[PDB]
Amino acid sequence: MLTTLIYRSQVHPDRPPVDLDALVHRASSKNLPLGITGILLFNGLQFFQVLEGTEEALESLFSEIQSDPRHRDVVELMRDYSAYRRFHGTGMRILDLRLFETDGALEEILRFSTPVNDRMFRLLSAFIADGGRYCLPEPLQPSRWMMMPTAAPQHLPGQPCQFALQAIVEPAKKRVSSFEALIRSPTGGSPVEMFAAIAAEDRYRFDLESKAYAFALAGQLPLGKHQLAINLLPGSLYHHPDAVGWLMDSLLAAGLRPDQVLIEVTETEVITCFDQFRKVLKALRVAGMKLAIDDFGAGYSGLSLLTRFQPDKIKVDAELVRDIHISGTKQAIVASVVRCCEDLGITVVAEGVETLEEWCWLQSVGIRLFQGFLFSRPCLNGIGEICWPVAR
Amino acid sequence: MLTTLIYRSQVHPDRPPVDLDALVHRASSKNLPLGITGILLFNGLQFFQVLEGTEEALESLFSEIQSDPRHRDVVELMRDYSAYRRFHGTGMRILDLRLFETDGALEEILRFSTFGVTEPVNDRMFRLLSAFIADGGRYCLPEPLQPSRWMMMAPQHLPGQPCQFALQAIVEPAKKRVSSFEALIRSPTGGSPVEMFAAIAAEDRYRFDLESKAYAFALAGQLPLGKHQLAINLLPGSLYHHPDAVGWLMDSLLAAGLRPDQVLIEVTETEVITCFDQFRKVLKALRVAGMKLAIDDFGAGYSGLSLLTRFQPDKIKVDAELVRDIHISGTKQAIVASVVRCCEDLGITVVAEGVETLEEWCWLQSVGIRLFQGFLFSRPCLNGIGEICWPVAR
Numbered sequence: 001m002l003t004t005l006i007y008r009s010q011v012h013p014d015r016p017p018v019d020l021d022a023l024v025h026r027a028s029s030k031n032l033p034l035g036i037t038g039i040l041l042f043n044g045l046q047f048f049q050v051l052e053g054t055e056e057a058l059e060s061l062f063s064e065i066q067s068d069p070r071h072r073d074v075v076e077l078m079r080d081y082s083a084y085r086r087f088h089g090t091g092m093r094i095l096d097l098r099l100f101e102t103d104g105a106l107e108e109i110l111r112f113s114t115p116v117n118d119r120m121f122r123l124l125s126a127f128i129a130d131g132g133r134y135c136l137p138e139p140l141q142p143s144r145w146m147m148m149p150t151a152a153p154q155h156l157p158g159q160p161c162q163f164a165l166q167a168i169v170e171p172a173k174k175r176v177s178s179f180e181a182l183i184r185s186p187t188g189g190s191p192v193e194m195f196a197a198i199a200a201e202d203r204y205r206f207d208l209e210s211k212a213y214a215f216a217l218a219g220q221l222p223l224g225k226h227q228l229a230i231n232l233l234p235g236s237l238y239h240h241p242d243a244v245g246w247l248m249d250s251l252l253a254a255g256l257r258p259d260q261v262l263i264e265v266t267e268t269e270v271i272t273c274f275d276q277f278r279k280v281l282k283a284l285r286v287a288g289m290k291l292a293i294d295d296f297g298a299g300y301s302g303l304s305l306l307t308r309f310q311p312d313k314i315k316v317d318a319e320l321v322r323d324i325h326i327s328g329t330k331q332a333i334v335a336s337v338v339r340c341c342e343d344l345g346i347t348v349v350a351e352g353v354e355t356l357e358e359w360c361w362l363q364s365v366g367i368r369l370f371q372g373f374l375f376s377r378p379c380l381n382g383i384g385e386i387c388w389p390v391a392r
Numbered sequence: 393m394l395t396t397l398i399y400r401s402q403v404h405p406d407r408p409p410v411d412l413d414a415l416v417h418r419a420s421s422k423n424l425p426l427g428i429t430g431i432l433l434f435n436g437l438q439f440f441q442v443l444e445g446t447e448e449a450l451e452s453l454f455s456e457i458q459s460d461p462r463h464r465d466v467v468e469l470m471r472d473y474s475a476y477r478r479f480h481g482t483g484m485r486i487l488d489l490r491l492f493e494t495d496g497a498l499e500e501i502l503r504f505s506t507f508g509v510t511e512p513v514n515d516r517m518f519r520l521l522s523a524f525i526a527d528g529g530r531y532c533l534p535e536p537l538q539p540s541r542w543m544m545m546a547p548q549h550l551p552g553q554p555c556q557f558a559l560q561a562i563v564e565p566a567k568k569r570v571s572s573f574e575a576l577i578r579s580p581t582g583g584s585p586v587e588m589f590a591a592i593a594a595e596d597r598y599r600f601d602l603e604s605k606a607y608a609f610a611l612a613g614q615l616p617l618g619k620h621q622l623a624i625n626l627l628p629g630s631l632y633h634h635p636d637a638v639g640w641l642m643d644s645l646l647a648a649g650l651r652p653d654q655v656l657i658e659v660t661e662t663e664v665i666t667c668f669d670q671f672r673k674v675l676k677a678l679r680v681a682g683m684k685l686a687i688d689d690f691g692a693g694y695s696g697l698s699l700l701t702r703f704q705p706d707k708i709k710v711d712a713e714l715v716r717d718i719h720i721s722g723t724k725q726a727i728v729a730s731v732v733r734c735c736e737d738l739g740i741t742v743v744a745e746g747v748e749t750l751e752e753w754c755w756l757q758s759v760g761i762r763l764f765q766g767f768l769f770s771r772p773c774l775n776g777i778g779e780i781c782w783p784v785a786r
């Protein structure tokens with residue numbers, strides 16, 4: 001089974017130059033007996049390599065390549081099965097693009113390779129035309145940042161539920177943007193643990209009802225000028241005819257403003273019925289409450305949803321964040337949600353941010369609002385401690 | 393009830409500069425009795441106006457504003473129900489951005505506006521305002537791509553067959569080149585795919601869908617396949633519920649004098665997403681075989697770029713729903729521009745389909761579409777290659 005692997009990487013710019021003639025010859029000598037072929041592209045700052053061979057030969061080679069100190073920021077762009085070798089007879093071969101006139105490098109490629117409808121070919125072009133695009137800038141290296149560190153956890157009695165709060169942060173302004181309320185059982189357990197105790201047919205009712213205790217928690221904080229974010233299933237919003245009006249009454253009694261309350265609905269559940277949700281949407285807009293699409297990029301129905309309606313906020317799902325520093329796929333998609341939301345005036349939050357590596361690459365694709373264990377953990381009935389990225 | 397209406401537009405650079413003083417006086421004087429507030433930004437080439445008022449008032453005004461000869465390329469950005477007026481003052485203020493340095497324009501805006509208890513940056517209107525001040529010229533339509541600077545410039549039935557195919561050219565206007573042909577199934581009487589499949593038993597539809605393609609392959613083999621690609625439409629089930637569909641297609645296209653790489657399979661976006669994990673083995677086999685894969689009708693229904701996380705197609709066809717009235721829709725403009733950029737980063741080819749007007753071609757090309765399919769260029773041609781119309785100057 002033939003397979004194609006493509007990645008891009010960067011040189012260490014303050015270190016002595018790597019002898020690439022030696023690298024490439026040694027590589028070509030090693031690749032061909034093992035049934036590995038392909039090319040290397042160098043532009044002065046970045047590498048771009050295509051590899052062809054069996055799944056097993058490429059995996060073992062790429063592990064060595066990943067851990068090679070002679071470059072950094074290895075980002076995979078393509079891993080897929082292949083119909084034929086595009087570089088038959090070429091173990092390895094470098095093209096220094098700086099030695100080439102316009103179109104010249106591509107025309108050399110085409111003369112030893114074995115045409116514009118190919119995914120490998122289009123990416124090559126894309127690297128030659130604009131390689132420095134998803135290059136991680138020097139200030140935004142994870143090694144040039146440092147996370148720096150008191151919460152008051154409290155049990156509230158006489159309550160059928162309680163809530164933890166997680167900060168959504170804007171590290172560029174060292175500012176809390178908003179807090180998300182996350183439901184907990186009476187004994188501090190998970191959302192699942194909470195809803196499992198409630199009878200199945202009362203779960204929509206309970207979901208709506210429980211929000212009153214989150215508003216109360218926001219009121220006694222006393223929150224001030226920060227937004228409150230709240231997870232509701234669409235079905236909970238259809239429970240009572242005046243579910244929106246009840247939310248309003250409840251949040252005002254907690255001393256909150258409507259523009260201060262934001263509703264989080266999951267991407268998968270909105271696409272179920274646009275007929276009944278739009279009546280709720282209209283009620284939320286008229287009342288002044290804001291809407292967010294939670295876990296965007298997970299439930300398949302992505303960016304075309306904006307044709308039907310536009311939320312105030314979009315929360316990028318954790319799956320798009322996991323290993324976004326090594327995935328070109330994820331980088332491209334996330335960066336396209338950013339740019340689309342910027343033109344539409346939609347707030348973008350990245351979720352499940354756990355590592356400096358994740359924060360840096362997300363910052364480099366243009367995300368400013370962040371939510372994750374890296375910055376802030378859920379804190380039962382209070383504001384938890386917040387960690388900020390500090391420069392080096 | 394209260395409504396927001398935000399748009400941007402572009403002045404005619406050919407014509408004399410617009411009297412803004414007369415504009416703003418008659419605007420604010422007419423707006424005042426009608427209960428219309430808001431703001432107007434101007435950068436020299438572009439207008440950007442926020443309008444607040446009742447739904448019926450803003451509709452009536454937008455009619456006149458769209459009809460106004462003092463500007464063109466009116467692009468609607470936001471229209472929704474509002475809870476409170478962001479601009480509370482009388483009438484209409486004008487803010488010439490040329491006379492402000494960085495951050496200075498937002499300062500001035502915040503003098504005439506409140507955005508609730510929370511930071512102004514949490515409001516969509518304020519974000520759209522900030523975006524215009526930062527880079528309003530982004531979706532400004534260039535001069536060479538104005539519609540007024542362009543203009544547009546036989547085979548029979550085969551009823552004795554179980555089915556026939558119409559061919560439609562996918563074109564690249566810039567290089568005056570036909571990129572590929574799509575095969576669209578037709579009934580023995582020349583009728584639509586719907587009528588065709590309606591005549592086939594439900595238990596037999598998948599098999600028919602796959603086995604019909606032999607007639608499409610035979611058609612393209614009889615035609616000048618001059619290093620052009622052939623696109624064909626298949627349901628997921630048609631590939632999935634066959635013993636070895638890829639092998640069958642391989643046998644059928646090779647027999648007809650075609651290369652594996654000349655054949656591209658189109659699958660509809662909606663029918664793939666709730667099917668994917670089961671459908672993986674077929675997509676894999678098509679890759680190894682050498683055939684190409686397109687996501688047909690991208691944007692249609694309930695799917696998007698989140699699909700591209702899973703697997704990556706060779707081609708993406710933006711649905712006509714997104715191409716429809718893209719010239720007046722900033723939402724579609726932003727969506728399509730984003731998909732184009734995304735696919736460039738992923739090495740995925742993009743076709744805009746259902747292109748009907750010079751207007752659509754212009755706006756699509758400006759946001760980075762190079763490949764087109766629609767009635768503007770080429771209509772479906774039964775059993776042959778149709779006449780392709782090209783856009784040229786004046």
Ligand SMILES: Nc1nc2c(ncn2[C@@H]2O[C@@H]3COP(=O)(O)O[C@H]4[C@@H](O)[C@H](n5cnc6c(=O)[nH]c(N)nc65)O[C@@H]4COP(=O)(O)O[C@H]3[C@H]2O)c(=O)[nH]1
Binds near residue numbers: 166191210295
């Ligand atoms: N691995 C990882 N996880 C992180 C990170 N940051 C936050 N999380 C977790 O992600 C969940 C918040 O996202 P969610 O879409 O609201 O996912 C929530 C939310 O959908 C939900 N939920 C919470 N409250 C309610 C509610 O009142 N009603 C409904 N219907 N659902 C709720 O149940 C889900 C489970 O929530 P939680 O236990 O609160 O788990 C929280 C949070 O702990 C991180 O950096 N890494």
Ligand SMILES: Nc1nc2c(ncn2[C@@H]2O[C@@H]3COP(=O)(O)O[C@H]4[C@@H](O)[C@H](n5cnc6c(=O)[nH]c(N)nc65)O[C@@H]4COP(=O)(O)O[C@H]3[C@H]2O)c(=O)[nH]1
Binds near residue numbers: 584601627765767772
């Ligand atoms: N208004 C407008 N329409 C345009 C324009 N350009 C093309 N079309 C039409 O859009 C349809 C092609 O899009 P499709 O995604 O393949 O959507 C097609 C395609 O999915 C499909 N179909 C065609 N052949 C087959 C087939 O063999 N198998 C399957 N499963 N579906 C097929 O049935 C759908 C309807 O097809 P058609 O009657 O052939 O109608 C064609 C075509 O006539 C345009 O500029 N404006």
Ligand SMILES: Cc1cc2nc3c(=O)[nH]c(=O)nc-3n(C[C@H](O)[C@H](O)[C@H](O)COP(=O)(O)O)c2cc1C
Binds near residue numbers: 026031040049066068
């Ligand atoms: C940009 C880059 C491309 C590389 N390409 C290859 C290659 O194609 N084949 C290979 O064997 N090693 C390649 N390497 C080197 C490997 O990381 C590793 O050092 C080498 O395979 C060690 O093999 P050896 O110990 O047998 O000499 C590359 C390294 C870098 C920096």
Ligand SMILES: Cc1cc2nc3c(=O)[nH]c(=O)nc-3n(C[C@H](O)[C@H](O)[C@H](O)COP(=O)(O)O)c2cc1C
Binds near residue numbers: 419439441456460484
């Ligand atoms: C960019 C621009 C913004 C405009 N804004 C307004 C406005 O806010 N209110 C208004 O009444 N007319 C506005 N107009 C003018 C209208 O298009 C139209 O000329 C106006 O209704 C005058 O018609 P009249 O004969 O009833 O006075 C605007 C025109 C332009 C080109």
Ligand SMILES: [Mn+2]
Binds near residue numbers: 180231264294
């Ligand atoms: Mn949530």
Ligand SMILES: [Mn+2]
Binds near residue numbers: 294295315
């Ligand atoms: Mn979430």
Ligand SMILES: [Mn+2]
Binds near residue numbers: 625658688
């Ligand atoms: Mn099609």
Ligand SMILES: [Mn+2]
Binds near residue numbers: 745
């Ligand atoms: Mn289509």
